[PDB]
Design a protein around this motif. Sequence first.
Motif, PDB file in Angstrom:
ATOM      1  N   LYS E  79       0.816  -1.209   0.000  1.00 57.26           N
ATOM      2  CA  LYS E  79       0.000   0.000   0.000  1.00 57.26           C
ATOM      3  C   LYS E  79       0.853   1.263   0.000  1.00 57.26           C
ATOM      4  N   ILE E  80       2.168   1.088  -0.082  1.00 58.94           N
ATOM      5  CA  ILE E  80       3.085   2.220  -0.090  1.00 58.94           C
ATOM      6  C   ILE E  80       3.495   2.568  -1.519  1.00 58.94           C
ATOM      7  N   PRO E  81       3.384   3.852  -1.895  1.00 57.36           N
ATOM      8  CA  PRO E  81       3.741   4.324  -3.237  1.00 57.36           C
ATOM      9  C   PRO E  81       5.246   4.297  -3.487  1.00 57.36           C
ATOM     10  N   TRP E  82       5.803   3.094  -3.575  1.00 56.66           N
ATOM     11  CA  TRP E  82       7.232   2.929  -3.809  1.00 56.66           C
ATOM     12  C   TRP E  82       7.654   3.567  -5.127  1.00 56.66           C
ATOM     13  N   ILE E  83       6.835   3.391  -6.160  1.00 61.11           N
ATOM     14  CA  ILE E  83       7.133   3.963  -7.467  1.00 61.11           C
ATOM     15  C   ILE E  83       7.276   5.476  -7.339  1.00 61.11           C
ATOM     16  N   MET E 104      23.078   5.723 -13.131  1.00 58.47           N
ATOM     17  CA  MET E 104      21.725   5.724 -12.590  1.00 58.47           C
ATOM     18  C   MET E 104      21.182   4.303 -12.622  1.00 58.47           C
ATOM     19  N   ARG E 105      21.453   3.602 -13.720  1.00 61.47           N
ATOM     20  CA  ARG E 105      21.003   2.226 -13.882  1.00 61.47           C
ATOM     21  C   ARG E 105      21.403   1.430 -12.646  1.00 61.47           C
ATOM     22  N   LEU E 106      22.663   1.572 -12.247  1.00 68.11           N
ATOM     23  CA  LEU E 106      23.182   0.892 -11.066  1.00 68.11           C
ATOM     24  C   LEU E 106      22.415   1.381  -9.845  1.00 68.11           C
ATOM     25  N   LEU E 107      22.459   2.692  -9.634  1.00 70.64           N
ATOM     26  CA  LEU E 107      21.786   3.336  -8.513  1.00 70.64           C
ATOM     27  C   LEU E 107      20.371   2.813  -8.298  1.00 70.64           C
ATOM     28  N   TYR E 108      19.539   2.927  -9.328  1.00 74.84           N
ATOM     29  CA  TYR E 108      18.154   2.480  -9.250  1.00 74.84           C
ATOM     30  C   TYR E 108      17.983   1.016  -8.862  1.00 74.84           C
ATOM     31  N   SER E 109      18.961   0.177  -9.194  1.00 76.03           N
ATOM     32  CA  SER E 109      18.868  -1.239  -8.852  1.00 76.03           C
ATOM     33  C   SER E 109      18.842  -1.371  -7.333  1.00 76.03           C
ATOM     34  N   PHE E 110      19.609  -0.520  -6.661  1.00 72.54           N
ATOM     35  CA  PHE E 110      19.674  -0.521  -5.204  1.00 72.54           C
ATOM     36  C   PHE E 110      18.343  -0.058  -4.624  1.00 72.54           C
ATOM     37  N   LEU E 111      17.735   0.925  -5.280  1.00 74.43           N
ATOM     38  CA  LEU E 111      16.454   1.466  -4.849  1.00 74.43           C
ATOM     39  C   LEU E 111      15.369   0.403  -4.974  1.00 74.43           C
ATOM     40  N   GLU E 112      15.209  -0.120  -6.185  1.00 72.95           N
ATOM     41  CA  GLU E 112      14.215  -1.147  -6.464  1.00 72.95           C
ATOM     42  C   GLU E 112      14.551  -2.463  -5.771  1.00 72.95           C
ATOM     43  N   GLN E 113      15.614  -2.456  -4.973  1.00 70.26           N
ATOM     44  CA  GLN E 113      16.041  -3.651  -4.255  1.00 70.26           C
ATOM     45  C   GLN E 113      15.823  -3.502  -2.753  1.00 70.26           C
ATOM     46  N   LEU E 114      15.609  -2.269  -2.307  1.00 73.36           N
ATOM     47  CA  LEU E 114      15.395  -1.996  -0.890  1.00 73.36           C
ATOM     48  C   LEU E 114      14.054  -1.322  -0.625  1.00 73.36           C
ATOM     49  N   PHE E 115      13.688  -0.378  -1.486  1.00 69.60           N
ATOM     50  CA  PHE E 115      12.431   0.347  -1.343  1.00 69.60           C
ATOM     51  C   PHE E 115      11.320  -0.298  -2.165  1.00 69.60           C
ATOM     52  N   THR E 116      10.872  -1.467  -1.718  1.00 66.61           N
ATOM     53  CA  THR E 116       9.813  -2.208  -2.395  1.00 66.61           C
ATOM     54  C   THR E 116       8.988  -3.003  -1.383  1.00 66.61           C
ATOM     55  N   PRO E 117       7.802  -3.487  -1.792  1.00 68.26           N
ATOM     56  CA  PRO E 117       6.940  -4.260  -0.894  1.00 68.26           C
ATOM     57  C   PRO E 117       7.549  -5.597  -0.478  1.00 68.26           C
ATOM     58  N   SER E 118       8.407  -6.145  -1.334  1.00 67.76           N
ATOM     59  CA  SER E 118       9.056  -7.420  -1.053  1.00 67.76           C
ATOM     60  C   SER E 118      10.217  -7.236  -0.082  1.00 67.76           C
ATOM     61  N   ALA E 119      10.570  -5.983   0.182  1.00 64.15           N
ATOM     62  CA  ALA E 119      11.667  -5.668   1.089  1.00 64.15           C
ATOM     63  C   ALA E 119      11.244  -5.794   2.549  1.00 64.15           C
ATOM     64  N   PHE E 120      10.008  -6.226   2.771  1.00 66.27           N
ATOM     65  CA  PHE E 120       9.485  -6.392   4.123  1.00 66.27           C
ATOM     66  C   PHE E 120       9.488  -7.851   4.560  1.00 66.27           C
ATOM     67  N   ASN E 121       9.583  -8.757   3.592  1.00 71.71           N
ATOM     68  CA  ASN E 121       9.597 -10.188   3.873  1.00 71.71           C
ATOM     69  C   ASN E 121      10.490 -10.482   5.074  1.00 71.71           C
TER      70      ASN E 121
END
Lengths: 122, 186, 193, 61, 145
Positions: E79-83, E104-121
Amino acid sequence: VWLGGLLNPEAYITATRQSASQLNGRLHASASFNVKGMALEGAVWNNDQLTPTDILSTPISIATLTWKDPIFNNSSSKLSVPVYLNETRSELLFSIDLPYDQSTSKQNWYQRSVSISSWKSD
Amino acid sequence: NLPDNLKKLFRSMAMIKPDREMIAQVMLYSQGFKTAEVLAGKIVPLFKLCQEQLSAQSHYDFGLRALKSVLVSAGGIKRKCQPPDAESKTKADQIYCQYEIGVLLNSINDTMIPKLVADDIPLIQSLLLDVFPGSQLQPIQMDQLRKKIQEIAKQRHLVTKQEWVEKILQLHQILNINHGVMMVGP
Amino acid sequence: GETVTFKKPISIANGPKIHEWLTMVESEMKSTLATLLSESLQHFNQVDVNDHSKYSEWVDNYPTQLVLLTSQIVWSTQVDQALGGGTLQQSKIQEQLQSIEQTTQMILNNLADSVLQDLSAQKRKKFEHLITELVHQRDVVRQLQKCKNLTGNKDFDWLYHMRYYYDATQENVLHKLVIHMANATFYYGFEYL
Amino acid sequence: TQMIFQNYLDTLSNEPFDPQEKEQQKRNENIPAGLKVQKECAAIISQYFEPGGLVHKVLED
Amino acid sequence: HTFIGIPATRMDKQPAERSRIYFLLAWFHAIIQERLRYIPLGWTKFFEFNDADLRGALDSIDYWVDLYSKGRSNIDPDKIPWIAVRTILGSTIYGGRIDNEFDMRLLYSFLEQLFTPSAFNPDFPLVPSIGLSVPEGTTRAHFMK
């Protein structure tokens, strides 16, 4: 040819484009030119696909670069690799798509920072 | 580069390379070019080349300012150049697609070749075909001036040579485009 | 060389001091533009889009500065009612959007040919500007029609851009227009440009 | 170079050396001794100016 | 260090899932910054990843993560607007000073790897090779340990 060794890679490549356009007419990896003396940094060549390795940069006997249009579909799965002008990574020559060893997650390949160098001291 | 006392009060935004393609596409739309889209994808490429494939002179410039300047002229030029089932469209449609390419070249030839030099005038020709196949540069339809120019020439005991008269015209055109024209030469 | 008669004359004859009448023009400048923007929205909102006969008349009625805002404010709201709020089958939103992508697209052509005709420079730039603007709208809208699964009039794929929202129900005349982009919100200074 | 040579020659049997002859000929046309001389000279040398002529062979060397 | 600035009187506030996200930022901010000493491998150049950026991100996270869960003692991950949060921390703060697209490509990988709904598992993977997974906590002191 020895791209990185030349005095202006940017020019040579941007020229092999129209010469290839005068014939059968975006770049592709393997009507087309051939470059030798490059260096893949971060991975290695295996079974025709970018594969992991403990060694930094490895040489590249040679490779073909065609200017097709098509084979550019399964890229969403493939890995994008930049072709700088040397280790410095302070000058990009051209981007290129190459299949990778799908064993290691794609995100790992990204954080893996894989690039190709043209000129390499020794 | 911000002073060591501002790199935390400001927010840095990288603007390395712009978007010429877009800028050009829309640039032409405002002129009346229905092809624009298609066009832009060629006008830009030509520029990128002319900068690295034409004798590197000191008075040579192919920056963004240049691309915008020329596209703008194509508008007025077109505003004064009356345009020309199944296999009916494909054929008739292409013809128009060309009319626009011609008007574009007429502009390049108007404010892009006068800048060119000797050894470069031939190279640019080749480059223009690879980009604009369905056409080639045209003469200077300015009989009005050419008539009065040829009069003054013979009056000042000047040799009304062909190539010569051409330049005097090169000015009249480029001046009605870039209010700031500079004539470089030995 | 553009002109825009105020909505309230400021007689300097009465005897206003140097800054007296000066501070007035600034107040009126914003007042005029404030009202005009609303009236433009009312005019446009009461004219046919296909009928470029009246459209070409709507543009020559207001200042280029405002002429554009209206098209922007109109574009904003339309894209929302076309997205709903998390509820509306893929076809629903995609259909609602397909229209806007086409409607504005049709307008571009009407102007594209109108610009290729005879008309002054001052009057031209206005059209040349509108062109540039409508091109942004259609382009942005298309980017949306590429997202298979959309949420609603709150999805970031929409909030990313800078939308413009009006509210004539507002007490103030200036604050009626509220610009939005991402989570940021600003107020149109109404500074005659 | 050939163009320039003609400009000089033409201007010779046209533009009078003496400023008086220029003003007197400008108000009379709407052949003082001077301007008449220039012509005779321009003819004697003319031949040497044409392509390959003396002037060229000498100017080049 | 990144925490000496993040007070408990701002990290333990509702929702309860906010404590997590903060930590995530500290980790993401600790990584991208740590890689600068491995150029040109870590990064093409050397981007000024100052703390000021971090502070800004925390404010943004406290916006989206507090906007879609104002009052509730908890909030659902999906329910969090990660995008929205990932874009703000991407092309307008951290990656804003990025010129090399591939960076940026590299950078964003870190973002989409930590700031996501699956990052709560539970036991979310951070550094697997050694055995490092997100600490199951919901308060400052919790994560500190």
